[PDB]
Design a binder for this molecule. Structure first.
Ligand SMILES: *[C]C1=C([C])[C]=C2C(=[C]1)N([C][C]([O])[C]([O])[C]([O])[C]OP([O])(=O)OP([O])(=O)O[C][C]1O[C](N3[C]=NC4=C3N=[C]N=C4[N])[C]([O])[C]1[O])C1=NC(=O)[N]C(=O)C1=N2/[C]=[C]/[C]=[N+](\[C])[C]1[C][C]C2=C(OC(=O)N([C])[C][C])[C]=[C][C]=C12
Ligand SMILES: *[C]C1=C([C])[C]=C2C(=[C]1)N([C][C]([O])[C]([O])[C]([O])[C]OP([O])(=O)OP([O])(=O)O[C][C]1O[C](N3[C]=NC4=C3N=[C]N=C4[N])[C]([O])[C]1[O])C1=NC(=O)[N]C(=O)C1=N2/[C]=[C]/[C]=[N+](\[C])[C]1[C][C]C2=C(OC(=O)N([C])[C][C])[C]=[C][C]=C12
Lengths: 499, 494
């Protein structure tokens, strides 16, 4: 019933917000729609897998907030396997490699690939993390899809195909679905292309021992009966002295402030009194989440390692159900597994099949890519199609179609009277990730502490000390990477010498 | 409590559905979120205006369903004033004209304009009204915005600027916001460019005497206590023998079937048990409504008529708050008024101002365009910003961003167990309009009648006889319009 702050949503962001407020001495209640906490994180446990992350899983250097929170809760990380060679599978053939970027030998194609990644980062540098709409060319870039940008930038099909896969994998959406400004912001606010795509030294370096679901679970353990499961929020009334929050199961909660820690669009599931301001009212109808099925195929042994493959496959082409895999074997070396994502339109297309049919297609793909008949002998399979989730809307996160971020972006974390906004979508560093969830939850919590006069304004946004356990190597470039011309750049250089 | 069919939403679509089912002998309940019916239609009455449509207003030839429904309810139409000249205001100057399309004199620009409109219709002919995702080039066209298409098609800035205005005015969204496939479908399913843009012999020919809100009001009068106002639906449970529908004010309704007659995205405001199928679950997060403020400035007299202007203004350019106006004077010739739309990003931008500040900006614009100081002396002002509406989401209708229609379009009117889908967005002829609202409401109603075994399958979709009061003249083209080359076509010929 009565409390200081109601947190709507018991994902990492809501739980981090609730914990901070609780630790500060406030009376908090977490209202969670599902019969579980964790939201877009979910760790399944059974005898066949021991544990497996079916939602958010990877953490890495520069994600210091999630690392710190998890460490405080008694959790540990381990390194995702990248000892052996990665595979880039292109036009029906596998090309093993090392280093984060799939290499190319053709001089023209090399210039094009180099320029593509470089340009993503160049453009990113013009985009403020906390205000992408303030980029000098914000409107121009927001009024273009990533498809248009790639069409302009990539002078080879090779680069365009890899760039497309990059977009699909990064934001679980098609290149034509998303704003170029938003996508460029998204990559930049994770630290750029190298950081976001890397396993070693990047976002995919690590996983939590026992699963990421433990973060939300262990905060629930700390909060006890303050977390209310199967309490979907249906109504928020701010017309009176205290804010009134009603749930579907007919309960009423009364608070001084509210934190909305749900995906922006899921705000639509709540009826507001008074109505939301016009800009937020429309914003929450313009911000869908991506489409993905996370699939884990289990094997007797990590047989790929014997062939000097680490388990990473970057698989181009329409025919492949999965465009990206990582070794998901336990740190102990047992429960051998390959994790793969079925992305964007393929998540829609292949959802029509049965679980067994998807398993078959994945095994046959992996057998081809790994050149290994052993891939046809799975021992177990788990999957989760996040498109079906009423209380997520999709995964990994919210994307912005062309035109939306410049028109509505400033609304995202603007308080509405006594409602403050958390959720990974409102983060400024690793938004879209568990890291961003922590940043946004704690920031929203501190906004309320400031509103209550408990902390000064300069304490709302707080820096995070670098993890001692997961130190971050700087992102470096070579002289040639910095200065080699683009394809059109080379052509202009030819034109001038000829004239 | 217990009934045959619960209709969620008391707009024209929900009301038309409820009326049909009621007339067939079923017990219907309409659950309406607001304290009024009509939804995206709203007629305000006061002494200063008598009545004024602040939402949907225009009807015209080929919209036979809304015309028939309104006639049955005892309503009449009158003709929007287009006796005198229209105005196209371009680069700070007014150019009066007659006919539906704003003309150009430069030969290259003429070819470009002619080709633009022609190409819109050419492309539309390949798009099935009832299945746009089945167009031969559906994916190619859906993966492009209208901005991209216009950049390809328009070889002159003149044509691109007019085409952009056309898009903004048609779908209250920016060219870069919307799918090319969806936009081309939208125009085609209204009968093409000429039909959609025309006052005389087109969508803007007429208004209802006394306001369009009377359609929903008069059906509410018929249904009596079956219409429940201030009953926002929050929960639908289909796990049991009868469907259970719960409202925000704590009431529970039990029915054999449900019609969802709300904008697709507003389905998000309802918690579903069991959860919606994946495709609908995501679809309803991908389909926003446009942005518009409808503004009506009142004057002592329709002074523009004295200068041989009808009141229609097509106003190019960023500076102009309003890109399009029509004479909104009563058929009797009193309550002289100009109706203007503030469109898309301008609705967002100018909402920051006060009502008085917007009035000043509109009056100064109209004075410039009409070349009349009289425009600076308004006697009254009414406006409505539809962006602020929790239970509409915007106006006029739902638009589809790139990639959405092909991936999710088939989901729109696919039943979910015992829930059937009405609402103008699900129509196949004048979707987006009051006409489409009627089509979809009656179709959804008949789906349920068929499910109950009361009518055969071939009766679900029903043709509509042409209105005797508002007959449609055919759309014609000239030989030169059909065969004159595009700009690139002329260049290839050279
Ligand atoms: C789903 C998912 C998946 C499948 C995956 C993933 C993910 C996801 N992610 C994301 C995460 O998870 C997120 O972010 C988080 O979790 C969020 O949180 P928050 O904010 O808190 O939210 P949520 O969870 O949702 O919560 C909410 C809550 O609430 C509730 N509700 C609702 N409604 C309501 C409620 N309540 C009451 N009432 C009402 N009304 C619900 O229920 C809930 O609970 C992630 N993340 C991280 O961190 N990590 C990871 O891993 C993840 N994942 C993924 C990712 C991937 N990635 C990374 C990828 C891989 C690779 C890559 C790349 O690379 C490349 O490209 N290459 C290599 C080529 C060259 C890049 C990029 C990307 C990537
Ligand atoms: C808003 C608006 C405005 C402002 C305007 C307009 C409109 C609108 N429109 C549309 C209409 O209105 C619609 O469609 C209808 O109404 C719809 O219906 P429905 O479907 O039924 O829906 P609604 O109404 O929304 O209803 C629903 C209901 O539900 C409820 N809810 C919600 N949620 C809920 C509920 N309940 C319970 N629960 C829950 N949860 C609500 O509340 C409601 O009630 C229109 N239409 C028509 O027809 N007409 C008109 O006029 C209109 N408007 C407009 C238009 C415009 N236009 C046409 C334009 C002008 C000119 C043009 C052109 O031309 C050109 O371009 N040029 C000349 C240049 C060269 C073209 C095109 C367009 C145009």
């Amino acid at each position: 019933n009565k409390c200081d702050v109601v947190v709507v949503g018991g994902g990492i962001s809501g739980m981090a917000a609730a914990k901070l407020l609780h630790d500060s001495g406030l009376n908090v209640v977490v209202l969670e729609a599902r019969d579980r906490v964790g939201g877009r994180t979910y760790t399944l446990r059974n005898q066949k897998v021991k544990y497996v992350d079916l939602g958010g899983s990877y953490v890495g250097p520069t994600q210091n907030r999630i690392l710190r929170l998890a460490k405080e809760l008694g959790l540990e990380t381990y390194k995702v396997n990248e000892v052996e060679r990665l595979i880039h599978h292109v036009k029906g053939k596998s090309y093993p490699f090392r280093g984060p970027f799939p290499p190319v030998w053709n001089p023209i194609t090399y210039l094009d690939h180099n320029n593509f990644w470089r340009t993503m980062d160049d453009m990113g540098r013009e985009i403020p993390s906390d205000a992408p709409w303030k980029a000098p060319l914000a409107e121009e870039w927001d009024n273009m899809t990533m498809k248009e940008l790639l069409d302009k930038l990539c002078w080879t099909e090779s680069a365009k195909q890899l760039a497309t896969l990059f977009v699909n994998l990064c934001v679980t959406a098609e290149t034509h679905e998303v704003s170029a400004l938003w996508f460029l912001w998204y990559v930049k606010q994770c630290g750029g292309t190298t950081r976001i795509i890397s396993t070693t030294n990047g976002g995919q370096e690590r996983k939590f021992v026992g699963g990421s679901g433990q973060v939300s679970e262990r905060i629930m353990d700390l909060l006890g009966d303050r977390v209310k499961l199967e309490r979907p929020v249906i109504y928020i009334d701010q017309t009176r002295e205290n804010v009134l929050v009603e749930t579907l199961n007919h309960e009423m909660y009364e608070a001084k402030y509210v934190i909305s820690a749900i995906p922006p669009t899921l705000g639509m599931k709540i009826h507001f009194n008074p109505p939301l301001p016009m800009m937020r009212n429309q914003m929450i109808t313009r911000v869908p989440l991506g489409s993905v099925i996370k699939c884990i195929v289990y094997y007797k042994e990590p047989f790929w390692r014997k062939k000097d493959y680490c388990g990473t496959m970057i698989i181009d082409g329409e025919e492949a159900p999965v465009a990206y895999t990582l070794d998901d074997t336990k740190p102990e070396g047992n429960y051998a597994a390959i994790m793969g994502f079925i992305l964007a339109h393929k998540a829609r297309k292949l959802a029509r099949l049965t679980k067994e049919e998807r398993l078959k297609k994945l095994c046959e793909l992996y057998a081809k890519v790994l050149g290994s008949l052993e891939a046809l002998e799975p021992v177990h399979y788990e999957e989760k199609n996040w498109c079906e989730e009423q209380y997520s809307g999709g995964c990994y996160t919210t994307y912005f179609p062309p035109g939306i971020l410049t028109q509505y972006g400033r609304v995202l974390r603007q308080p509405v009277d006594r409602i403050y906004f958390a959720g990974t979508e409102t983060a400024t560093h690793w938004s879209g990730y568990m890291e961003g969830a922590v940043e946004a939850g704690e920031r929203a919590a501190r906004e309320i502490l400031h509103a209550m006069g408990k902390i000064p304004e300069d304490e709302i946004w707080q820096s995070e000390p670098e993890s001692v356990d997961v130190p971050a190597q700087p992102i470096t470039t070579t002289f040639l990477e910095r200065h080699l011309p683009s394809v059109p750049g080379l052509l202009r250089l030819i034109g001038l010498t000829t004239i």
